[PDB]
Structures are given as C-alpha cells and as structure tokens.
Amino acid sequence: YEHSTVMPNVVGFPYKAHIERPGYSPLTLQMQVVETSLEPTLNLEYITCEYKTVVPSPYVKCCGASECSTKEKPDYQCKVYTGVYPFMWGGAYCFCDSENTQLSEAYVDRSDVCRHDHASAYKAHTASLKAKVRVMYGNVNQTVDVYVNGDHAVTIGGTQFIFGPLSSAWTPFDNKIVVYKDEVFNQDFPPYGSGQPGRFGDIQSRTVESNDLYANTALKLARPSPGMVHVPYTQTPSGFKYWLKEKGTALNTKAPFGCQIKTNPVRAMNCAVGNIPVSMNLPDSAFTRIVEAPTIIDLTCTVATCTHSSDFGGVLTLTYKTDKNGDCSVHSHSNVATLQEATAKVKTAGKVTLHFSTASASPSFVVSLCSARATCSASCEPPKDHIVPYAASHSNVVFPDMSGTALSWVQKISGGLGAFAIGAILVLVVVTCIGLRR
Amino acid sequence: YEHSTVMPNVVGFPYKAHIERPGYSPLTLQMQVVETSLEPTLNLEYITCEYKTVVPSPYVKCCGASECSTKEKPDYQCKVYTGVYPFMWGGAYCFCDSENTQLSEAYVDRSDVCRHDHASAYKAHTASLKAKVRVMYGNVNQTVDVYVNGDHAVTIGGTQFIFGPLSSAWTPFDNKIVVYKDEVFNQDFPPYGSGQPGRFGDIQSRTVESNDLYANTALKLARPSPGMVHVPYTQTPSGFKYWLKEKGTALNTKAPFGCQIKTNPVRAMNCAVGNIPVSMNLPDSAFTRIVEAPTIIDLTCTVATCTHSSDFGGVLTLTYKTDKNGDCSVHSHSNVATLQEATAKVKTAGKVTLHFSTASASPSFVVSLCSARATCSASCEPPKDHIVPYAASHSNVVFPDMSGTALSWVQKISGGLGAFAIGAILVLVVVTCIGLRR
Amino acid sequence: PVPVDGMEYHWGNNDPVRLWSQLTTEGKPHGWPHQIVQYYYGLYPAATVSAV
Ligand SMILES: *[C@@H]1O[C@H](CO)[C@@H](O[C@@H]2O[C@H](CO)[C@@H](O[C@@H]3O[C@H](CO)[C@@H](O)[C@H](O)[C@@H]3O)[C@H](O)[C@H]2NC(C)=O)[C@H](O)[C@H]1NC(C)=O
Ligand SMILES: *[C@@H]1O[C@H](CO)[C@@H](O[C@@H]2O[C@H](CO)[C@@H](O[C@@H]3O[C@H](CO)[C@@H](O)[C@H](O)[C@@H]3O)[C@H](O)[C@H]2NC(C)=O)[C@H](O)[C@H]1NC(C)=O
Ligand SMILES: *[C@@H]1O[C@H](CO)[C@@H](O[C@@H]2O[C@H](CO)[C@@H](O[C@@H]3O[C@H](CO)[C@@H](O)[C@H](O)[C@@H]3O)[C@H](O)[C@H]2NC(C)=O)[C@H](O)[C@H]1NC(C)=O
Ligand SMILES: *[C@@H]1O[C@H](CO)[C@@H](O[C@@H]2O[C@H](CO)[C@@H](O[C@@H]3O[C@H](CO)[C@@H](O)[C@H](O)[C@@H]3O)[C@H](O)[C@H]2NC(C)=O)[C@H](O)[C@H]1NC(C)=O
C-alpha cells in the first residue's frame, strides 16, 4: 500500500503519520530525525602556510670581481657589491685594499612544517543532505542512515522508505571558503598567482606535496656595512601569521538556523530548515484485519487540564464503549495539538487518558480512537516560567478557534452590527418600495 | 599598461590583438587555443557488475528433519523438501524408506572480476574549463596551461594574463551519467536499493570495496527430481550482461559542437562554443618608442586577387613612403577579413604584400601599417572546390559592403524611386498651396 | 536576548548551552474583553494594536 507524507526537518520533533486503509484498522507510525548532515562539494584552489627565507653564506671574492647568475627559485634576489673590505676574528682578509667583491643571494621556501600547519582555500557548491531517522510502528523500532534525495530507498521491517529532496536549497557556505584546522571562514581569497605581500596568500601552492611555489613577499637586499660580513635584507612579514591574528569571527559562531559547523569533512549539522517528503510502501502484514480490531462507538472527549507550554501540558480523557478488549491507534488530525503517543489500550471499563502539547489559547482538534472520531476543545492558560532548556513539542500555531472566547465575543459583536444593518436595509427597502408604488 | 579583449573559443584560430599606446608604436599579439578540456564534477552513486550465484552442496538427513535456518546474505534462499530417496554411484543410501529430507540453499555474490569490469553511475554538475594557450609577440613563443576562469593569473615574459570565464554555461553532460571503460552514456539509472531484475542495476554496490551489496535477481528454488541430488533453481540472467549488448549509441559518437569525450578523468576535449575574455598587463619593455618606429605617410591599398575561400585566398599590395627602414605592426580593423601575419618588414622601396582571408563577395576593411591607415576594397570570386579538409580561417561574415556591386545597384534603384516620390510630393504641395492661397 | 527560536552561548572551554523562551505573558485569556487584548499584546505586541 502506497502512502506519502511530509515531515518537518527538525531534530527531535516526534512526527506521527496516520494511514487509513479501506479494509483494515487504522495505523499510526512514528518517524523522528535523530541527526542531520549537509556537506558541500569542495575543489581545492591552493594552500597557504608560513614561509622561510633561505640566505646562504656570502661569497666574498678577493682581488677580482664576480657576476650574478639568475636562478629559477621563488622570489629570488641576487646582487653584487664592490669595494668591500671585510674583517674576521683574526684579522682582515682580502689582502687587496679595495678591489674586492661580495655576492648576496636570498630566496624563499615553504616552512618545514607546512604539512602540519596550513590553510586550504576551497570553492563550495551543491550540498547534499544526509540524515539518520528512527522509524517505529507495531513491533518495529529501528534507526537507519539515509540520503535525503529521491534516489535512495531503504527497507525497514519489509516497508520501503524514500526520503525525498529537502524543500529548500539553503546552504550556509557561500562560493569561496577557507578551512583552517577545525574552523571554517566564509572568505573571499585572491586568485592563484596574484597574491600580495603581508596579506593572506602571499605564498601559494596547489597542493601540500606540490613541487612549484608562488611567492611575493617583497624581499630586498641591502649593502653590507663596512668591515663586516652579514648579508642584510628586508622582507614583509608572513601574511599567514597576520591572517591568524586578523582573520575575524568564523562560520562556526555565525551560522543561521542554529547548526554546528564541523570540519574533515566540511559539513553543517542539525540545521533546522525545510520539509522532507516521504514515500512509503507497506506490506499487508503491517495492518490488522478490521474484524479482530475492537469496535468503538459513542466516543466523547473532555479536556481535563491545559496550559500552552513547550512540553506536553494538556491532559485529555476519552469515554467510549467497546465490544472486545484490545489496542487502538490514536491520532490528532490537526497540527494545533501534538499527541504524546500513538497507541492506547482499550478495555470494557471505557476510559482512556492521554497527553497533548499545544501553543494556542483555545485549541480545537479532532481525535480518533481506532475508527471512531471525537472533537476536543479547551481553554488553556499561559505558563509562568520565562525560559526553558528544551525546544517546543508543538508546531507554533497560535490563532485561536472560532468558538474560543475572543472570537466568540467578536462573533457576537459582528452579528449584532450585521442585524442592525439588515434591519436598516429592510426599512429603506420598504420605504422606497412604498414610494415607488405611489 | 592594462588591456582587455575577447577571443573565439575555437582551436587553431589565429587571433590577433592590437594594442595602441598613446606614447608608443602599436603592438600586435597573436594568441591561439591549442587545446581545451571541459571537466565535470562527479559524485559516485554506485557500481554495477555481473553477479555470481553460489550454491553449496545439499544436506540430506536420513530419518530426520532439517529445520530451515535464516541468515543475512544478499538475495538468500532456503527450502526443505521431504521424502527424498537419492542415489549415488555405488547405490542408494538412507536406509530410511521415505521419512528423510533435503535442505536446499543458494545466494548471490559480486563476481570475482568485478574489480576489473564494472560500470559506474555518476551525478555530474558544475563543469570547469581548462586550456593551453600559445601567446606570441616580439620574440617569444610559449604555451601556458590556464584555468579558464577569472581566478588564475599566469605570467609570460613579464606580462601577466587572466583568461576570463567562458561566455556560455553549456555542458554536454546530463545530471546522470554512466561510465563504462572508455565510454560515457547519458542515462537515468534506478535509485540505490531499488534495482530491478534483468536490467541495469539488478545488483548494486556503493563502491568497489564496499562490503554491503543489494541484489534483486529473482532467485527461486525447486524440488529435486526423484532419486537424484542436484539442487535445481531458476534465476533471471544478469542485467549488466543484458545492458552490455543493449545500451545503445554512446555520447562519444553523438555530442554536439564536435568535441571528443574521454575518460578517467571524464572530460570533453576541444568543444568549440562560446567566447573567452582575456585581460593582460604589459610592461613598458614590450613597446617601442615612437621615435624608433619608422614614420609612414601616404598609405594606399590595392588588392591583386581574391577568392573568398577557407584558406588565405586574397592578396593585398600596400604602398607608402618611409624615412627609415624597420618593422611595422600591421592590423586589419574589421573581422570581415583576417590577415595572415602580424609584422611587416618596412623598407625604402615602398611595397609590402599581405595575405588575407575573407568569406564575403565584396569586403571593405581598414588596415594599418605602423601608425598609418588605409581603406581596402575588393571584389572577390567564389571558389571551385566543394569540400576541403581544414577548418575555415575567417569569421564567416558574409554581408557585403554598401559600396559593392549588389548594394550599389540597390542604392541606385532606391534613389531613383525616392526621387520620383519627392517630385510627386513637391508637385502635390505646390498645387495644394496654390489652391489654398485662392 | 532569547527569542522563541532560541539562543546559544559559549563561555570558556566548556560546551555551548542553548535556551528557549516560552509563550509567557501578563494578561489573562478568557476574561473581560479588555484583558484578552492585554494577553495578545504581551506576546506579539505589534500586530495586536493594528488588528484592534
Ligand atoms: C697575493 O696578493 C696579491 C696582492 O695584490 C694578489 O695580487 C692581485 O692578483 C689579482 C689576480 O686576480 C689581480 O687582479 C687582476 O688585476 C688586474 C689589474 O688591476 C685586472 O685588470 C684583472 O681583471 C684582475 O682582476 C690584482 O690586480 C693583483 N694585485 C696587485 C697586482 O696589486 C695576488 O693575487 C695574491 N695571490 C693569490 C691570491 O694567490
Ligand atoms: C526504540 O529503540 C531505541 C534503541 O534502538 C530505544 O532507545 C533507548 O532509549 C532509552 C532512553 O530513551 C535508553 O535507556 C537509557 O540508557 C542509559 C544508559 O546509560 C541510561 O543512563 C538512561 O537513564 C536510559 O535508561 C536505551 O538504552 C535505548 N535503547 C537502546 C540504545 O537499545 C527506544 O527507547 C525504543 N523505543 C521504545 C518506545 O522502546
Ligand atoms: C539404522 O537404520 C534404521 C532403519 O531401519 C534407523 O532407524 C530409524 O530411526 C528413526 C529415528 O530414530 C526412526 O524414526 C522414528 O519413528 C518413530 C515412529 O516409530 C517416531 O516416534 C520417532 O520420532 C522417529 O520419527 C525410524 O522409525 C527408525 N526405523 C525403524 C525401522 O524403526 C536407524 O536410525 C539407523 N541407524 C543410524 C545410526 O542411522
Ligand atoms: C613558436 O614556437 C614553437 C616552438 O617550437 C614552434 O613550433 C614548431 O615549429 C616548427 C617549425 O619551425 C615545427 O616543425 C615542423 O613541423 C612541420 C609540421 O608539418 C614538419 O613538417 C616539419 O618537418 C617541421 O618538423 C614544429 O612541429 C612546431 N612544434 C609545435 C609543437 O607546434 C613554432 O613554429 C613557433 N612559431 C613561430 C611563428 O615562430
């Protein structure tokens, strides 16, 4: 038997679906979302880490000159300084008084730990939602891992389940992303081959193990001071270390809809938005023949107490009379009130009690025990507590019933004014018809 | 000096760009696309292959009954049959005349070479373009590997290029793809866990190494024939084998725009569609000061021969007079005609010959040598060969010049009719004015 | 602030904590008509005025 429903994408909300097959007693099965995960598809642009400047010993040629030789090294700098006269601890070498020369070289490289401490720059698109759902009905109670798209069918107790695509296409990750350790930054980074000194990305590499490197750190050589050997230089400090101090916030602490950002792999979890369509295919052994199901007549519903709090703050009593003792399946045909359970024990004594949660001043909903029906209406009082550590068990429906006190009063007033208008219309009609008849 | 232009996305086309700095002599860059590859992003859905039915030896109990034991195997089947009297080569065992049983068992498994011969079901989206571009100006070639998006800057001889995003967002891949060896098929496969017997995907596995397997092959058992031990069964033949001979065409033999489909990684090669913007940032060493460039004055253009064919079928002779001899940058300022070469060796004799290709009956285009300009008009005759083995070397512009023979005839005839109309209007105005003045 | 949607605070190394607000107000429903308006003004205090 095929059935289709829609359940809210809320973790911990007890969804209950009511199946009413023509030949069998009604069935109520409970579905709950234990967990959720939403992962974008990432393709790596480059990585960044702190650099390291390589400065070899200067070549001081005495009594002669040297020539600078170009090399294919990242941000390579080389210059030749003439007229040097260095000293060392024992004396001054370069016997020639002023026909000497020094060669200074410097380049940059990735730091020795770039495979341990680095940041990845990604582009994110087309997230896929996975879920973990517990389904329970009859003697079946079991939890499954599913892909939330119309392209994954699972079997639970012989029943086939397909959890269709999510209602909305909202994702918290925008086009460009930067990942550092276990923190995701919702950032726009410079293109590859176009990094700037002192900012994020002043050195860029396609992969951790890649061999070529791009570097732009404004490294510049300077003339050595007279009488000493040292190779001076100036270089703008690392842009990775500057990002580490001026990165700003994170997506972990900003994300809407209250969802946790995890890394490795990058994902957003328990992120309450949208609805999940569900398609079902049940066997005939899930139901019960309407013969051995109990027969209930004269179903009366009276509300004992009500207070529209987050938990199950209303109590409900049903009176009936039955021919045989057995089990029935209760259900509330409105989302104004959410019931605690999906099954009751019927006995010849004729009294069952059950708990419901609502959020409106005066609810009115129809409840059904096996095949019977009844209408329940109540007047509920506000709670006194201001703040609670748990989420609502209701659907946040507030608009009151037409028989409730507020709308009853409005109905009385509007009816009085309408009667006044109708009477005046009749008076004018009679007078104008008399005027016409003359 | 930053400059910006656009290129056709056709392989082998000789694009020529003209840069005209106010303080310098003009420059001409030549760019070609040597190769492209359009890469989709894939999500593996599952793996399909031929199955293997495993059937253990049967169990026969003499004066006993065997109780059927269930277990968790893919598409597992077990039965017990009563009253067997098997015979073997030496005779019939089971003294027990009738009250003895046989237990039949069978299940499905992934085949021994599924690691080597399988088909993969993918979801494809968000393709990325990558190219090899040959850039030449002054005294260098080079070919560079570029990601064709606005986020890759590559330096050639001191000039850095960004090849902008392709104008179109066209891809030859649908949402769902099936890859087999070296072929790609645009095909909708069944959802995982919902494959049907005898068709593609009767057995599904989430990955080659995955331990779990879905099998729906309609395996059934039957009673053994009397006096015999053989475990019969009937079971629908494989769906991977069935698909292999009934898949139908491919994408390799079908794709629009003439692009080659290749695999691992799956990509579309040389797939001529759209336009690509390019932005450059040239140094000052690229240009030549206007003082060094020869001064060209009194420039005229005359065409010797035309044939608006695919290759370079038009010849152009160009006259001038110069004060020194050197190099000029020639350019054709309309896409109605395409010049073969980018620089001309200018001498004091006063003649340069240029080769151009067009597809219009009467081209008209302005060409510049160094800094001079001239307008070239030609009357070109159609080819004789019907079919050629090379691509067109023009831009397929056909509308003629307004001074061509056909448009000249149209212009004369329309002018005559307009003169008749103007005379009619004037005479009517004159007569109406005379009558009104009465 | 703690709206009806909830709020989350993280303080130090220990785990973040969530809090939700209840539909609490100061009037009394099912009373005189000038108290029902007070009830519906305590919660949603911007559409009640327009509707009245
Ligand atoms: C021992 O010390 C003497 C002290 O001068 C060194 O003599 C110097 O030797 C170099 C050899 O490279 C001479 O350089 C050459 O000088 C000429 C003329 O200036 C120049 O045109 C060449 O290009 C080259 O650089 C240098 O002039 C000379 N000094 C003098 C003659 O006063 C000698 O080399 C030392 N012996 C060693 C290091 O084995
Ligand atoms: C349907 O099946 C699930 C399990 O598949 C049942 O979950 C059960 O939940 C209860 C509490 O809701 C768990 O009991 C708890 O055990 C911890 C152990 O430290 C104890 O400290 C708690 O005070 C509480 O007693 C129970 O372990 C868990 N069952 C499992 C994990 O197998 C669920 O209750 C079932 N539904 C129904 C209606 O029975
Ligand atoms: C040697 O061969 C003899 C056959 O002549 C086997 O004896 C047979 O054993 C089975 C099982 O004990 C007997 O089945 C039983 O039947 C009675 C009804 O009389 C029933 O109450 C039991 O529950 C069971 O079904 C079978 O009757 C019996 N055959 C005869 C003729 O009595 C014997 O088992 C063989 N020995 C070995 C070691 O296999
Ligand atoms: C730009 O630089 C490239 C780098 O070499 C040049 O490519 C090569 O050009 C030579 C011609 O000098 C080609 O060799 C010839 O190829 C023809 C093809 O039919 C063959 O018949 C000849 O025997 C000879 O081998 C060579 O194939 C070509 N290489 C590639 C990869 O295209 C190019 O010529 C330079 N362009 C200019 C305008 O300077």
Side-chain angles (χ1 to χ4, degrees), chain B residues 355-377:
Chain B
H355 295 343
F356 77 101
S357 162
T358 186
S360 163
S362 58
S364 179
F365 60 101
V366 64
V367 55
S368 62
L369 173 74
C370 278
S371 178
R373 289 176 181 266
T375 304
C376 301
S377 295

Side-chain angles (χ1 to χ4, degrees), chain B residues 62-64 95-96 99:
Chain B
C62 304
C63 288
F95 281 74
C96 282
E99 184 178 1

Side-chain angles (χ1 to χ4, degrees), chain B residues 329-401:
Chain B
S329 300
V330 292
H331 189 267
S332 163
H333 298 288
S334 180
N335 55 15
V336 66
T338 293
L339 297 167
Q340 178 167 35
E341 68 275 16
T343 66
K345 185 67 69 177
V346 65
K347 293 182 183 293
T348 187
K351 299 291 180 68
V352 297
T353 300
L354 303 175
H355 295 343
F356 77 101
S357 162
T358 186
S360 163
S362 58
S364 179
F365 60 101
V366 64
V367 55
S368 62
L369 173 74
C370 278
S371 178
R373 289 176 181 266
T375 304
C376 301
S377 295
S379 296
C380 315
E381 295 290 322
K384 54 182 316 293
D385 291 350
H386 276 260
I387 288 166
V388 298
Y390 45 66
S393 174
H394 43 65
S395 297
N396 287 316
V397 168
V398 176
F399 203 77
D401 188 37

Side-chain angles (χ1 to χ4, degrees), chain A residues 89-112:
Chain A
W89 62 263
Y93 66 98
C94 289
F95 192 19
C96 288
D97 189 63
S98 71
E99 317 96 310
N100 303 295
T101 291
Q102 182 188 109
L103 183 65
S104 306
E105 293 179 353
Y107 59 104
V108 296
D109 194 18
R110 269 177 289 191
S111 80
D112 303 335

Side-chain angles (χ1 to χ4, degrees), chain B residues 44-48 119-121 189-192 200-201 204-207:
Chain B
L44 187 53
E45 286 278 341
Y46 53 86
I47 300 299
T48 300
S120 299
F189 42 87
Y192 186 100
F200 183 72
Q204 295 157 320
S205 172
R206 198 62 92 164
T207 301

Side-chain angles (χ1 to χ4, degrees), chain B residues 94-426:
Chain B
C94 282
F95 281 74
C96 282
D97 50 3
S98 65
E99 184 178 1
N100 68 41
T101 60
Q102 196 200 114
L103 187 145
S104 293
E105 215 188 353
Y107 61 105
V108 189
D109 196 357
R110 184 196 290 106
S111 79
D112 285 324
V113 299
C114 188
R115 185 177 65 247
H116 304 162
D117 185 4
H118 59 250
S120 299
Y122 289 108
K123 274 209 179 73
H125 45 62
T126 300
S128 68
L129 182 62
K130 177 205 303 179
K132 292 178 71 68
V133 187
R134 184 203 295 293
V135 174
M136 38 187 306
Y137 68 94
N139 68 1
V140 298
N141 291 322
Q142 313 172 32
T143 71
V144 292
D145 291 330
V146 189
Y147 292 97
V148 177
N149 53 5
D151 291 331
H152 189 91
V154 66
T155 299
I156 296 170
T159 306
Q160 64 85 30
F161 293 93
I162 295 91
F163 291 82
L166 183 63
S167 88
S168 67
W170 176 89
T171 188
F173 293 139
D174 283 332
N175 194 25
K176 289 181 161 186
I177 292 297
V178 169
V179 172
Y180 181 61
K181 287 208 177 322
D182 211 294
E183 293 179 353
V184 177
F185 307 91
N186 274 322
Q187 180 184 354
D188 291 1
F189 42 87
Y192 186 100
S194 178
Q196 296 300 107
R199 298 291 182 183
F200 183 72
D202 46 24
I203 69 167
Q204 295 157 320
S205 172
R206 198 62 92 164
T207 301
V208 184
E209 293 83 3
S210 187
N211 291 343
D212 55 43
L213 181 76
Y214 173 76
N216 184 22
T217 53
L219 167 65
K220 285 181 67 177
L221 300 172
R223 297 195 76 253
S225 299
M228 187 153 210
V229 57
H230 59 100
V231 180
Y233 71 96
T234 177
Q235 189 250 338
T236 292
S238 166
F240 185 62
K241 299 289 94 176
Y242 169 83
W243 180 75
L244 267 187
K245 71 206 163 53
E246 197 95 14
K247 42 190 183 289
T249 77
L251 194 50
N252 296 26
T253 62
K254 208 175 65 179
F257 282 119
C259 63
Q260 296 86 18
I261 304 298
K262 285 174 165 47
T263 302
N264 64 7
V266 58
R267 57 198 182 277
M269 295 298 291
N270 298 317
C271 191
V273 54
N275 289 358
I276 62 171
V278 57
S279 305
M280 51 219 80
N281 181 295
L282 295 99
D284 268 20
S285 297
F287 297 92
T288 186
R289 310 209 75 86
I290 193 165
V291 176
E292 277 60 18
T295 301
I296 303 298
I297 191 166
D298 276 346
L299 190 67
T300 62
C301 180
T302 46
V303 297
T305 76
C306 274
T307 298
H308 61 88
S309 55
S310 288
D311 59 332
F312 292 108
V315 176
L316 191 145
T317 189
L318 183 63
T319 62
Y320 56 87
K321 64 179 73 175
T322 175
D323 47 318
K324 67 176 73 67
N325 49 1
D327 292 331
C328 284
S329 300
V330 292
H331 189 267
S332 163
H333 298 288
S334 180
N335 55 15
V336 66
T338 293
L339 297 167
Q340 178 167 35
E341 68 275 16
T343 66
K345 185 67 69 177
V346 65
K347 293 182 183 293
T348 187
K351 299 291 180 68
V352 297
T353 300
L354 303 175
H355 295 343
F356 77 101
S357 162
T358 186
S360 163
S362 58
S364 179
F365 60 101
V366 64
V367 55
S368 62
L369 173 74
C370 278
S371 178
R373 289 176 181 266
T375 304
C376 301
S377 295
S379 296
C380 315
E381 295 290 322
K384 54 182 316 293
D385 291 350
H386 276 260
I387 288 166
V388 298
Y390 45 66
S393 174
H394 43 65
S395 297
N396 287 316
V397 168
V398 176
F399 203 77
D401 188 37
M402 201 81 189
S403 277
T405 303
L407 272 185
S408 178
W409 276 95
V410 167
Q411 193 179 272
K412 287 174 184 180
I413 295 177
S414 59
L417 295 198
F420 191 42
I422 281 175
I425 291 171
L426 267 191

Side-chain angles (χ1 to χ4, degrees), chain A residues 41 123 125 147 151-153 176 191-193 206, chain B residues 43 45 126 147 151-153 176 191-193 206:
Chain A
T41 62
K123 313 198 55 152
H125 42 59
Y147 282 74
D151 185 281
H152 185 181
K176 293 182 168 185
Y192 184 89
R206 284 304 198 173
Chain B
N43 300 129
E45 286 278 341
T126 300
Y147 292 97
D151 291 331
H152 189 91
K176 289 181 161 186
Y192 186 100
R206 198 62 92 164

